[PDB]
Each structure stands twice: as structure tokens, then as C-alpha cells.
Swiss-Prot record, chains A, B, C, D:
Family affiliation: Belongs to the glutamate-gated ion channel (TC 1.A.10.1) family. GRIK2 subfamily.
Name used for this protein in its record: Glutamate receptor ionotropic, kainate 2
Cystine residue pairs: C64-C315
Assembly notes: Homotetramer and heterotetramer with GRIK5. Tetramers may be formed by the dimerization of dimers. Assembles into a kainate-gated homomeric channel that does not bind AMPA. Can form functional heteromeric receptors with GRIK4 and GRIK5. Can form functional heteromeric receptors with GRIK3. Interacts with DLG4. Interacts with NETO2. Interacts (via C-terminus) with KLHL17 (via kelch repeats); the interaction targets GRIK2 for degradation via ubiquitin-proteasome pathway.
Tissue expression from the record: Highest expression is found in the olfactory lobe, piriform cortex, dentate gyrus, hippocampus, granular cell layer of the cerebellum, and in caudate-putamen.
Sugar-bearing residue positions: N35, N41, N243, N346, N380
Organism field: Rattus norvegicus (Rat)
Gene from which this protein is expressed: Grik2
Cell compartments where the protein resides: Cell membrane; Postsynaptic cell membrane
């Protein structure tokens, strides 16, 4: 039988239920257990631990508790300060570390036991930069939220040194949801073409404050850096004449992918969130779409490797895992067509820089696909 | 007697001797032991460990080895990925963590047991931004090296949204010291006013490549973000008619501070570095000036706290240190006039945002102080 | 057999080995002895003497010692005050005097027994004057070193009486290598187009002081009067955007001439000079290229004259040498294609005014031939 | 008694009698022999030899014949190529060498046994350059004759690099007295302020060709570099309204100096020269005034040195003369008020740079003294 024990480190939600990434890790393990074509001989169990996500010492202790109990791969702790502490544990002891969120990989880590299923912002910032040239902009305002967002969109800030733009980089207020003094300066400065680097939970809150201001007109164009633009209640903004361009990697135009998302709204349901937030009700974010994908791409690697045995390692007496070198190379050479499209990894550094996007814009009917991005091709926009 | 045991985590230099920060930690402990006014009853020993500085798992093990052996404060492991792993250990177990280098404090860490003696780049980027307005620039090029340098100078990038500039943000080549294709684009683009965000070991290498190009003339003006501009062999550049503006926090205009630097060249000497690098020979960097200061500011706190006892804590069974709360508040409320001037800490977050700079520029004679920055006052430039 | 005894008077180098002209005289005699097409029946020996070069009385005694011992031609003592003393001895006693350096021939010497293989500055100063008109200059600064340099470039100083220029004649400092107060006046006076009349050992020292000043830019253009511009380490000046125009008579674009220069670096090698001089290592100067040529052009004359016998003459009882009139006319009517190109003499005064130059300028790759001068044609510059 | 034997080397005039310098050497020896205050115990004889003046080998043989016969000082052979051959003989054997003509002393001769009684052109070219500033010229034409005249007036050519002039340097025709095509270009170019660097035998021939042209008017001003401007028949040019400025060192405004010149016209007389030359008849040139002075200044040195004995030296077995060091220092420290004024020598190099001139210009009456030059003072022009 040989039950595998893919471990995971997730957020400790105090009041509410388990998070969307923790549900998607439980849903993807149960899907492979029920289905019989993928892994027809083995079953998957899990060892999910809950941390604060903002404490590298709690993430380091529970990652060593999973390797002492014996796991095969750690599914990342969702945060830059916490994943860097668990990445180096997984490097030292040979166990893979599967990342589904963006993290600043500094250019001096010689770490090899990690892959990142999140679309890398060296590729995404070229997708925005191609998109501002299709629209023939010459005056752009980038509004980010946290200081790490300069590292994300740095290929867009280095654009007036090459192309013909003038970037005016602005930042959202750090403490409050009171971005109206930001939007007053953007209205007085006549900044009609704006790029927002913020999550869809925050991008929904800016659009209410841009509607309370006089900024949702036929003159304003908003490109959103988030991949969850198909999660917003856009009904107050369809008839304004705005354009709200963005991307979508979640391949919701298949009968197989949408069937999983239609099943997703059932088991998640459990008191859906607040009504005064401009998001939808039944929707899978791309944060939980990549955790459903992260279990399956590694499941390609355990399918092509039947001699696998989960060992029990110790952090104090660290030894590399016996099959760690080959099993890491089977993850980096794994191809899969998951919810977010084709999943191929970067052979140099282990990232995900080759992926397919879907350019979506706001029409009178709603968010509609008007193109397709591809790092080999570029914007094939059939608008 | 009560010997204290200030611990430290430093770089493992393989071929050469101990690093400049490790010498400055040994020199500052031996200075307080020899001198009798500061701590007239106690002596200081140390437990210096050597790590890779790019491995958070090695820094986490040796920080727990110091707390198992029993230390009073950890002097930081000199790097963003390594200090974040040791900051959270020192937070969980109550021991202070003394930082002498800049690190991206994310806005969600609820850590309290850390202070940073490095001048914070929220204050330094206002010192550069005041300096480009004294010089009445309207066209600025910021050249950084690593992607974290956008977080450092982010108050300068958000300047064309307020003032009258146009920033053209550029980046040094990531792999090679071959910044001449960068300097060709800056020469063809007619970019005479340049800000360099790079270390003085790299800023010396850019000036050779700006002299090999036709870019050291009476038209080019270079502001350096580094505080070690008074460490460069500037003899090939005095007569060019260039201006090389910068800052200096190392208060080398006192008979007491310069006496320590004159003693510094003796015990450090030990095969001084390569001749094909445009730096000086006998000089203390500001990286080792802040480690000499870091021992003394905490020595103010052990002077005002005689009931101190060093305990032995364990990371697996983590308990806060018995005097950790009061001793951390005595470090944050400690004032000291060290090598880098007056040392007062930020009462909100524990940083160092209130400090005195010395604006230095290049004249025909050499680097000469032409002003003084102060967050309360601003540029008092008697040029 | 009839061994010939071409004599020579050279510099007494005290510390180091024999000079470059004395090596080239030994190398050219040994080449004709080894080769069998030129002089297939006779061999050449030599009687090299060493003087101070600045004492006409020592040069006069050793020239009479060579004629008492019996020579066929004296190869000149490399200096104006010393060669004039030996020219008149060779005139009185019929022996030829072969000159390879420039000397002020006053317009009243009725001397006939001398030829000069150095390119005459009545022709060279027209080559510079054609070159400042191809570049369309209207404001020229001539910087010479010694007062004889006005006689050299006098056809360039008499140019504003004919053409449209304004010469500002300046002089290098007489005692020191401290030409920076000269270069300050040329920088404050905005003198971008400069002609340097100095040797390549001194022209390498001016370019360091023009790089220490802000004067190696894309605005400054330097014409060098020396013919050894292809002997300078030009690597610090390739990327500056400067132009460094000059000439080259040493025909280094043949497989036969460069083969001799490739053999030249072997026997000369013998502790190559100082590293703090901006010259190359393996190179033949045009001062030693003309001494290799001086032996061969006279070897054309002994090939066309087999009845030659070397006699023994006395200066106190001076008698013309028996074959002095015919053998001098065979040297003046000798054609040879040596290292410096075709070697034909002026039939009026015995000089060398008909010769081929190669206009070389500084590109990004290095010194590159961009034309060809010729007294019949002029500048055929395929730049 | 101790008869001294001051030797001399002069011109071999074939057809006519002895030259003006040879008469002045015979006249000055006979004057000191007749007079009894100067040298009241010793008499002077001489050993005058005649050379071609353009042959350094004939000058070298007869200088060794005088030292073999035994002389005390050689009075120079009047020419640059011949005096350099005799200067080095007198240096090697200790005998002084008294020069009365200008010669290019190169900056590398370490010769000590020579003095020059001719007014040095480093001082004279400052006297012309002060004179063109008193007259407030801004456009100057320098017309020289031979290429050595650039070395003479080089402090005047380097003037537009300091002051406000524009020099147009021209040259007289080398072969013919046909300077009218030169004067046509100076008339068409409107060059009214001209400096002539030529002898008074040639300056008289230019003024006929400037009178045959339309160039002797009230618009043309001619400064003459020669010191024999008070030797020209100026009667055709008094009423033209020209100005002909110049200098005079021959102190013809004393009753003692003019008495010697009135005696000079008696013994010289001997078929006075051609009538078609615009010079006077009874006049002493400054070339023969300095040879009368050269015997007397050395006669000061033999008066202050009674233990002198003339020895007999050989050039082939050269030994320094026994009293050569002290007797040379008595010549350089000798003061005399001769025909040309006060005679003091330059203590550094042995030249004559401290002397008194008399600025003379052309009035309606004739050449009239209008000032006085002095290197300490400058132009004290009481015009
Ligand atoms: C349970 O079975 C397998 C487990 O490996 C799941 O993967 C699918 O397997 C089938 C055949 O092995 C393939 O189906 C493909 O579906 C896509 C729809 O996106 C279609 O374009 C292809 O032409 C093909 O029909 C495929 O290898 C794989 N599906 C994907 C998306 O990679 C399967 O989805 C599970 N569920 C069911 C209901 O079978
Ligand atoms: C594995 O990782 C490396 C490093 O990220 C990938 O190299 C990158 O490949 C792209 C090819 O598109 C390079 O060019 C970039 O293309 C865009 C297209 O518009 C254009 O704006 C520029 O030409 C831009 O440079 C990119 O420079 C290069 N990155 C580096 C650091 O060299 C590589 O493709 C990955 N391997 C895969 C996906 O198989
Ligand atoms: C403790 O830390 C806080 C934040 O780290 C410090 O507050 C900061 O104070 C500076 C200067 O007052 C503010 O910067 C800017 O000042 C200039 C000129 O006054 C102007 O361009 C802006 O209006 C801005 O105020 C900075 O924004 C502010 N930070 C925050 C978050 O409010 C505080 O001063 C520190 N306390 C000390 C050193 O005692
Ligand atoms: C032998 O020597 C004499 C003089 O040393 C040479 O005569 C010289 O020839 C050159 C060129 O023909 C004359 O230079 C100048 O030429 C240019 C352009 O043609 C122009 O700017 C002037 O009009 C001038 O002619 C130079 O003046 C002339 N020298 C004399 C004194 O007449 C002669 O060419 C030599 N013979 C050979 C090399 O066979
Ligand atoms: C013969 O005697 C001496 C030989 O040494 C000649 O030199 C003159 O000697 C006298 C008295 O020793 C001085 O005369 C001076 O004359 C100048 C006129 O230029 C006058 O300004 C003075 O006030 C003084 O009277 C003087 O030392 C010297 N003369 C000069 C010009 O230096 C003397 O000239 C010979 N001839 C006669 C006729 O005495
Ligand atoms: C011995 O020889 C030296 C070298 O020739 C003499 O030094 C020269 O002295 C003059 C003083 O007048 C220096 O200044 C020159 O003065 C004129 C006056 O108008 C002015 O145009 C400049 O200031 C000019 O430089 C001159 O530079 C200096 N020569 C050198 C090469 O330094 C010295 O005076 C002689 N000793 C005597 C006469 O006792
Ligand atoms: C020893 O330590 C004491 C610490 O107080 C030093 O004394 C201080 O010296 C500075 C200038 O040297 C003064 O500004 C302070 O006021 C002094 N403090 C006190 C309390 O007097 C002393 O300089 C140190 N000596 C050595 C040799 O290191
Ligand atoms: C030996 O001397 C002869 C001299 O004639 C050289 O032969 C000449 O070589 C050059 C090129 O090498 C040709 O352009 C000439 O036409 C040749 N002349 C003749 C008559 O053949 C020969 O190269 C010399 N060889 C060596 C090794 O020095
Ligand atoms: C909306 O999109 C269309 C198509 O690109 C464009 O013509 C229009 O200007 C856009 N509206 C804006 C930018 O407000
Ligand atoms: C671009 O899109 C068109 C139609 O949407 C289709 O031919 C194909 O998807 C793309 N063509 C390419 C990539 O050549
Ligand atoms: C540079 O500094 C100099 C002083 O050395 C000053 O005169 C000048 O204004 C500054 N700026 C420029 C652009 O030269
Ligand atoms: C800076 O301030 C100090 C005291 O506050 C003063 O002594 C100095 O002159 C000031 N600098 C100026 C005015 O340039
Ligand atoms: C210098 O040479 C370059 C070629 O390298 C040419 O383009 C330019 O016109 C020349 N002159 C100047 C003043 O740069
Ligand atoms: C110079 O002339 C030669 C032949 O006379 C010719 O090959 C060359 O092309 C010419 N240079 C030019 C035209 O720039
Ligand atoms: C002659 O001299 C006087 C006095 O300097 C002057 O005014 C006049 O112009 C001169 N004549 C010329 C220069 O032709
Ligand atoms: C200048 O000349 C005046 C009168 O000609 C006279 O005082 C003296 O000769 C000179 N004065 C000086 C040099 O002070």
C-alpha cells in the first residue's frame, strides 16, 4: 500500500474555520485518494500544522516536528519570513519544500530543494508591461501596498530607462483603509491610467473609494496585478464605462476545471464572508488553486518513483534524506495540466516562469477574456 | 565579579582572518574590560559563532547553542535572511538581539526584542532627497544593485509624485563587475546626476569604469548612498572637476573618536587587502563602527542594572528570560556618544531614525565636510 | 671575403644594457651576415663606441678613433650637438655619416657627406597641417617640449598667415613631469583640439595627467607629432570617447616586417621597463626601426660597388677617402623597402622628404589605421 | 711682466680686410696695453686664428692649436655650429670660453666654462613684449629670417596664451633679397604692426622694399629686434610719418663711450662698404661693441688674480687647467661698465640677462631715445 505523508504548515485561524489553502490541501489529497488513475496503488495522508505565519521560530519548530514524525514534502508556510526559515530546513535535510506563494529569493541562497508554483513576477511584470504598451500608455501610476511590492514590479519601474513612459510610484496607506487622500492626489494630478499592486481583498476596497470619488468614469483605466480579478462583485462598475484590465491564470474555461470549482463551493461553504466586501460568494482564489495544483504535481513525481520510502529525520543530527536528490529532480521535471493551466518549472532556479495567462477586461456584461499572454509569444489579444 | 557573556554570530571567513565586525566585537569587549569607568565591577566575555550568513538553519542552531550555554544578548548575523531567523528566537526567549545592519522589517512582525544601530533608510532616503533639492536637480538616475535596494530608497522613488523630478531607476549587472554597458546607456541618455545605492567596495569599482568611460568630468555629479565614502582612494578623481557628494556618520572630527580609529589600524593590520581595489588601507568602515557602538550601548544598560544574572534557556522548551523585559527597555532608553555620534533609539519600533550625518563632497584637496544633516533641522550646509 | 667595418657612435647607458639603437645596429648587421641574398660575398663587422651624447668633444674624439682604425660609414650620435660635430669630421675626410634622428640643418652648412633617414619635419608638419584641415579645425593649441620644437613644427605655426586658424603655442614644464598647471590653463581656456610635439615616453605621461584632469572626454581631440603612437598602452583611453590621431611610418601591416618585430622582442627582452609607464612591452620604436633601415640602405650601396676598400685616415692630416665621392652618391641613389616603408632620399640636400605614412586614430577597439599620407597625393583617408 | 695670451677664433674674410669683431679684439688688447690703470704690471698678446665659421672641424682643430700653444681664454667663433664645438673643448680642458654672440644653449649641456656677453633673448623678448603692450597692440606680425629665430623670440610667440594678441608668424625669403611677395601679403592682409627679427644689414634692405611698396606711411609701425637700429641711414624715412621703435644697448650718451667710437672710425676706415646699402659709414656695431667688452671683463679677472700662469694643454691627453676653476668664477663675478653699459653675468647659467636698454624711436629729427628698459623695473618711457 505504502501510505505517503505529505506534510503542510498553514495559518492558525482562531475564530473562523481552516483557511482556503488548508481546505485546498485537504481537498486535493482526498481527490487523489478517491480517483484511481493517479496513484493506483498508494494513498496520501497529511500532517498539517498551524502557525502564526509571522513567526519564523514557530515555523522552524513545527517543520522539524514533521520531519521527526516523517514527511515527504512540506507545503509552504504562505509568508516570506516564515517560508525562508522552512526553506533552509528542507535544504539541509533533503526533503522538498513546495511553495505556492511569491517570496523574495535573494540572489545568494544556494538552496536547491524548493519549487514555487506561483507565477513569478519576473514574468508577470513583463505581462503588465506588454499590456501598457498594447494600450499605448505614456503616463502610468503604480500604486503598491507594502514595500516588497517594489521587488515584485521592478521590471515595470525600470521601464522609462528603456521605453517611453513616466512612472509615478505611489503607496497605499499603511495603517488604514482610508485611501481617499491617496485618490485625491491622483485625481488632482490627473492620473487616469493606474496600475494597482494589491490583493483582491484590498482591490475591492479601493474600487468603493474610487466610486465614492469621481474616479470610475470613461476616462480612468485600471490594470490590476492580482490574478483574482474574476472574484470581484463588478456589478456597480459595469455601466460606468471604466476599463478594468487584468489577468487570470485560473483556467475557468474548461468543463473539467470548472467542475472542480463547482464542487469547491460545497465543502467550503461554512458561513461565507462579510456582505460589505465587494467580492463574490462561491469562488476559488488562485491562492487555493495553486495548493490544489501543488499536491498533484508532486503526485506525478510519486507516480514515476515507486521505490519511495518515507524516513524519519532529525534537525539536530541533520542527514540528507536517502531519496531526496532524485525525488526533487522528478518534481522539477514534472508537467501537469491543473486548474491554473500547464505547470512546468524553471530548470535553472526552480521557479514558475513559463505559464499561460488570460487577459480579462471589464465590459458592459462583466469581466470578459480579451486575450492570452505567453512568454514565448506575447499578447495575442483578440479584443 | 559577575562576568557577562554577550554572544555573537558572525561570518565564517575560510581563507583570511576574522571579519571586520568580529574584530570590532572583540575590540569593544576588550576596551570596556581595560577601561574602569564603564562597568567598574564586571567584566565581559563572549561566545562568538561563525555561520555562512546565507543559511537560516545554521544561524538558528548556533543561536540556540548560545542560549543553551547562556548569553545576555546576540549581536546580529549581518544578513537579512539570517537575522530574521535569529530575531524570532530572541523574541520567543526574551533575550535581546542587537542589530548593526539594515534589514527589511516587514509591517506584520510583532517582535519587540530587537534594536538596530544602523541608520534607518526612512531617514537616510530623506537625507538624499533633501540633498538633491539643495543641488536643485530636476533629472535624477538611481542606480541600485540588488532588488532590496528599492525598499531602501523608496522615499526617493516616491518623489516625482510630490516634487519636480523624473527618476530613471537602473540596476547594476547582477553577475559581473562589467557595468560599462550600464554606463554607456547613461552616457548616451545624458544622465549627469546619478545616485548610487551600492557598497563602498562596489562604488570604488564603478568609479574606475566611469573613469575608463568619459564620465568623470565637470558635468557629472554623483551622490553615494553608502556611509563609507571616506574610505575610497579618491586621488585619481580630485582634479577631474567631478563632485562626489555623500554622507558620513562616523564622527572622525574628534580627538577621542580618531584615537580609537588610529588604534584600529594596529590590531587589524594582518595582510591588508588587494591593491587593485580603490579603497584605503587604514580605515574603519561604518559596519565595524556600529559593532563597536553596539557593545557600548548595551554596556550602558548593564551599568544601570546590577542585579543581572545570565540564565540558561532552551529553544525546545522556550521560556522568557527572567529579566528580559526590563533589560530590553534599558537598551531602548540608552543614550551613548560613540564613534558614529549620539546613539538614541526609536521609541516606537526600536530602530535608529534620529542621528547626525556629515555631508561630505569632493574638492581638489579631497573629501571635505560641507554640511550637517539632522532629522529635526535638515541640511545646515556651510558649503 | 673583404669584411666591411661600418662604425657607429651610440649612448653610454650606465646601469642598464645597450640602447635600442645600438641593439638595432647589431641586429641589422647580424641579419645581413646570416642572409645570403644581400651581400653574397662580404660580411659586416662593427666598431661601436659609447659617448655621453651631450658632449661634442667626446663624440669628436671617438669619431676620429673609428677613422684611424678604419671604418666605411659612421651611424650618427643620436643628438643635435653631437651629430653636428661628427657631420663635419665626416665631411672633411670623405667618409659618409648616416643619420637616423632629426637635427637642425642650418642653411649655411656646405656639407655633402650625410644622409638622414628620419622623416623630415618639413614634410611631417605638412602632414599634421593637412590633418587639421581634414578635421576642419579653426582653433589649435600646439604644445611642444623643448625650444627646438618650434623649428620642427614651423610650417604649422606659419599657418594662420595663410589658412583660417588661430594657434596658441604652449610649452610643457622644463624641469618636472607636472604638466597639470599647463592642463588647467588649457581646460579653463577651452582648448579642445591639441597638437602634442613630444616623444612617446612623454606623451604617455601627459595622457595620465589628462585623465587625472577632466580632459579625456568625447570633446577633446589630440594629434600626436610622434611616430610611435602605436607603442602606448591605450586601454584606459579606448572607452572614453576621445580621438587620438597620429601617424605611423613603421609598416606593421606586412608579414615580412612584423616577422622582424616578432623576432625583435626575443633578443631585446632583458628586464623590460617600468610598469608605471603607459607604454607596451614588446614593441620596436621608430628610432630603432630607422637604424635597422640605415644598415640596409648602405648595404645596397656596397652591393653595387664591389671594388670597395676600407682605408685608414687621420683627422690631424685630413685627406678625403679614395672612394668617398662615388660611395656617397650610391647611398643617395639607393632605394630600399625596409621596416619604415620605401626609403628614397632627397636629391637636393640628402634628407628624407618622400615617404609613406599611415594615419592612425583611436577607436573603441584600439589604434586603427584610418588613412594614408603621401607628399605627392595627400590624405587618402578611408576613415 | 707675465705677458698673457688671450686667444681668439674669428672669420676668414678672403677678399676684404679683417672683420669687425677681429678689429675690436685687436683694439681692446691694445687699449689695455696703452692704458696703465687697468693691469699696471702685465701686457696682453693674442693668437687669433681664422676659420670658415660654418665648419665645426676647423674650429675644433684651431682651438686645440691655441691650447697646445697655450692660451688663457678663447673668444668665441661667432656662430652656433662652431661655438658648440669649441665650448665643449673649453669645458673639458678648463680654459674659459668667452662668447659674444647668441647661441641656442640646449637644456642638457652640463657645461660650466662659458659666459655670453650677448644680451639674452629670454630678457630681450620680454623687452619687445613689454613694448608691444605700451603701444597697446592687439594684432602683431613677427617676421623672422632663419628658423633659429623662433627660439630667439619664443617668449613673444607664447604671448596669446596669456595676453590679448594674435601673432601671425611669417618668414623672410630664404634665398633672395626679394621680400616684396612677403610684403604684398602683409599689405593685402592689413598688417600695420610688424616685428622684424633680422640683422641691421637685412633690416636696411627690407625698408627699401617697404618704401618701394606703399608701406612707409603714418599707419605702419615697425619694432626691430636688432640692437643696431642706430646704424641705419634713416634720412629717407624721417618725414614719412612712420614709427620705427627699437632698442640700443650701446651706451652712446657718454663722453667716454662716444670717445672710443670716435676713435673707432679712424683705424677701421679701410675702404668703407657699399653705397647701395642703407647703413651709415662711421659706426660701431653691437657685435664689435661686445668684443671690446669681452676683453675688459676678463681683464677685471686677471687684475684680481696675480698668481696666474698660462699653461700648455693637449686635447688628446686632456687635463683641466690648474687655475681654471677659480679664474672662471672671477669672470662670472666680474662687474664692468663698458661700451654696452653695466656687464653683470647670470649666476645660474653664465648668461647675460641683467642689462640696461635704451628704447629708441624714429622722430622727424631722427632716431631718438624715448625710454629705458630694465629687467627689475620695466619700461620707464619718458616719450
Ligand atoms: C481522475 O483520473 C485522472 C487521474 O490521473 C485525472 O486526470 C486526467 O486523466 C485523463 C486520462 O488519464 C486525461 O483527461 C484529459 O482531460 C483534459 C481536460 O482538461 C482534456 O483536454 C484531455 O483531452 C483529456 O481528456 C488527463 O490526462 C487528465 N486531466 C487533466 C486535466 O490533466 C482525471 O481528471 C480525474 N477525473 C476524472 C473525472 O476522470
Ligand atoms: C529559467 O529561468 C531563466 C531566468 O529567469 C529564464 O530566462 C529568462 O528568459 C526570458 C525569455 O523570454 C528572457 O528575456 C525576456 O523576454 C521578454 C519577452 O518580452 C523581453 O522583455 C526581454 O527580452 C527579457 O529579457 C529573460 O531575460 C531571461 N532571464 C534572465 C535573468 O536572463 C528562462 O527562460 C527559464 N527557463 C524556462 C522558462 O524554460
Ligand atoms: C519613531 O519612529 C517613527 C516612525 O518610524 C518616527 O516618525 C517619523 O517622523 C518623521 C519625521 O518627523 C516623518 O517623516 C517625514 O517628515 C518630513 C519633514 O517633517 C515630511 O516630508 C513628512 O511630512 C513626514 O512627516 C515620518 O513620516 C514619521 N513616521 C511615521 C510613521 O509617522 C518618529 O519620529 C520616531 N521617534 C523618535 C525618533 O523619537
Ligand atoms: C628635395 O628637397 C626639396 C626641398 O627640401 C623638395 O622641394 C619641396 O617640395 C614640397 C612639395 O612639392 C614643397 O612643399 C609645399 O607643397 C605644398 C603642396 O604642393 C604647398 O603647400 C606649397 O606650395 C609647397 O610647394 C616645398 O616647398 C619644396 N621645397 C622647396 C625649397 O622648394 C623636393 O621635393 C625634394 N625632392 C624630392 C623629394 O625628390
Ligand atoms: C684708462 O683707465 C681706466 C683703466 O682701468 C679706464 O677705466 C676708468 O677708470 C676711471 C678711474 O679709474 C673711471 O672713470 C669713470 O668714467 C665714467 C664714464 O663712463 C664716469 O661715469 C665715472 O664717474 C668715472 O669718471 C672708471 O673706473 C673707468 N671708466 C669706466 C667707463 O668704467 C679709463 O676709461 C681709461 N681711459 C682714460 C682716458 O682714463
Ligand atoms: C639668472 O637666470 C635666471 C633664469 O633665466 C633668471 O631668472 C629669471 O628672472 C626673471 C625676473 O625678472 C623671472 O621673471 C620674469 O620677469 C618678467 C618681467 O616683466 C615677467 O614677464 C615674468 O614674471 C618673467 O617670469 C624669470 O621667470 C626668471 N627665469 C626663470 C627661468 O625662472 C635670474 O634672474 C638670473 N639672475 C640674475 C639676473 O641675477
Ligand atoms: C574610559 O571610559 C570613560 C567612560 O566614561 C571615558 O570617559 C569619557 O570620556 C569622554 C571623552 O574622552 C567624555 O566626553 C566623557 O564625559 C567621559 N565620561 C566620564 C564619565 O568622565 C574615558 O575617555 C575612557 N578612557 C579610555 C582610555 O578609553
Ligand atoms: C633575405 O634577403 C632577401 C633580400 O633580397 C629577402 O628577399 C626579399 O624578400 C621580400 C619579402 O620577404 C620580397 O618582397 C623581395 O622581393 C625579396 N627580394 C628578392 C631579391 O628575392 C629575403 O626575404 C630575406 N630573408 C630573410 C630570412 O631575411
Ligand atoms: C476602454 O478600452 C478601449 C479599447 O482599448 C479604449 O478605446 C478606451 O479608451 C478604453 N477606455 C478608457 C481607457 O477609459
Ligand atoms: C492567437 O489567437 C487566434 C484566435 O484567437 C488563434 O489563431 C490562436 O489562438 C493564436 N494564434 C497564434 C498564437 O499564432
Ligand atoms: C560642484 O562643486 C563645485 C565646487 O567644487 C561647485 O562650484 C559646482 O557648482 C558644483 N556643481 C557642478 C555641476 O559643477
Ligand atoms: C549650523 O548651525 C550651527 C549652530 O546651530 C551654526 O554654528 C552654523 O554656523 C550653522 N551653519 C551655517 C549657518 O551654515
Ligand atoms: C572622433 O572620432 C569619432 C569616431 O570614433 C567620430 O564619430 C567623431 O566625429 C570624431 N570627433 C569628435 C569631436 O568626436
Ligand atoms: C586610396 O587609393 C587607393 C589606390 O590609389 C585605393 O585603393 C583606396 O580605395 C583609396 N582610398 C579611398 C578612396 O578612401
Ligand atoms: C607713432 O607714435 C605715436 C606715439 O605712440 C602714436 O600715437 C602714433 O599712432 C604712432 N604711429 C603709428 C603707430 O603709425
Ligand atoms: C624714470 O625716468 C625718470 C625721468 O626720465 C627718472 O626719474 C628716472 O630716470 C627713472 N625713475 C625711476 C626708475 O624711478
Amino acid at each position: 500500500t505504502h501510505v505517503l505523508r505529505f506534510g503542510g504548515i498553514f495559518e492558525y485561524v482562531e475564530s473562523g474555520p481552516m483557511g482556503a489553502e488548508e481546505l485546498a490541501f485537504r481537498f486535493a489529497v482526498n481527490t487523489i485518494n478517491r480517483n484511481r488513475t493517479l496513484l493506483p496503488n498508494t494513498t496520501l495522508t497529511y500532517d498539517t500544522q498551524k502557525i502564526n505565519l509571522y513567526d519564523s521560530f514557530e515555523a522552524s519548530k513545527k517543520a522539524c516536528d514533521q520531519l521527526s514524525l516523517g514527511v515527504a514534502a512540506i507545503f509552504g508556510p504562505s509568508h516570506s519570513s516564515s517560508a525562508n526559515a522552512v526553506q533552509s530546513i528542507c535544504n539541509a535535510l533533503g526533503v522538498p519544500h513546495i511553495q505556492t506563494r511569491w517570496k523574495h529569493q535573494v540572489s545568494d541562497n544556494k538552496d536547491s530543494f524548493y519549487v514555487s508554483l506561483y507565477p513569478d513576477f519576473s514574468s508577470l511584470s513583463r505581462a503588465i508591461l506588454d499590456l501598457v504598451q498594447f494600450f499605448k500608455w505614456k503616463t502610468v501610476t503604480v500604486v503598491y501596498d507594502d514595500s516588497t511590492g517594489l521587488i515584485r514590479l521592478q521590471e515595470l519601474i525600470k521601464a522609462p530607462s528603456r521605453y517611453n513612459l513616466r512612472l509615478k510610484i505611489r503607496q497605499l496607506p499603511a495603517d488604514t483603509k482610508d485611501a481617499k487622500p491617496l485618490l485625491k492626489e491622483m485625481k488632482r494630478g490627473k492620473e487616469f491610467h493606474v496600475i494597482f499592486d494589491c490583493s483582491h481583498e484590498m482591490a475591492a476596497g479601493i474600487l468603493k473609494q474610487a466610486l465614492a470619488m469621481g474616479m470610475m468614469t470613461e476616462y480612468y483605466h485600471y490594470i490590476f496585478t492580482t490574478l483574482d480579478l474574476f472574484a470581484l462583485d463588478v456589478e456597480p462598475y459595469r455601466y460606468s464605462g471604466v476599463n478594468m484590465t487584468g489577468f487570470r491564470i485560473l483556467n475557468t474555461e474548461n468543463t473539467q476545471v470548472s467542475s472542480i470549482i463547482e464542487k469547491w463551493s460545497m465543502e467550503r461553504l461554512q458561513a461565507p464572508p462579510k456582505p460589505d466586501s465587494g467580492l463574490l460568494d462561491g469562488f476559488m482564489t488562485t491562492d487555493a488553486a495553486l495548493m490544489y495544483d501543488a499536491v498533484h504535481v508532486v503526485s506525478v513525481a510519486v507516480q514515476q518513483f515507486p521505490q519511495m520510502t518515507v524516513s524519519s529525520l532529525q534537525c539536530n543530527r541533520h542527514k540528507p534524506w536517502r531519496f531526496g536528490t532524485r525525488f526533487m529532480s522528478l518534481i522539477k521535471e514534472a508537467h501537469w495540466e491543473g486548474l491554473t493551466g500547464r505547470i512546468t518549472f524553471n530548470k535553472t532556479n526552480g521557479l514558475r516562469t513559463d505559464f499561460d495567462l488570460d487577459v480579462i477586461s471589464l465590459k458592459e456584461e462583466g469581466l470578459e477574456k480579451i486575450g492570452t499572454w505567453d512568454p514565448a509569444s506575447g499578447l495575442n489579444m483578440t479584443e
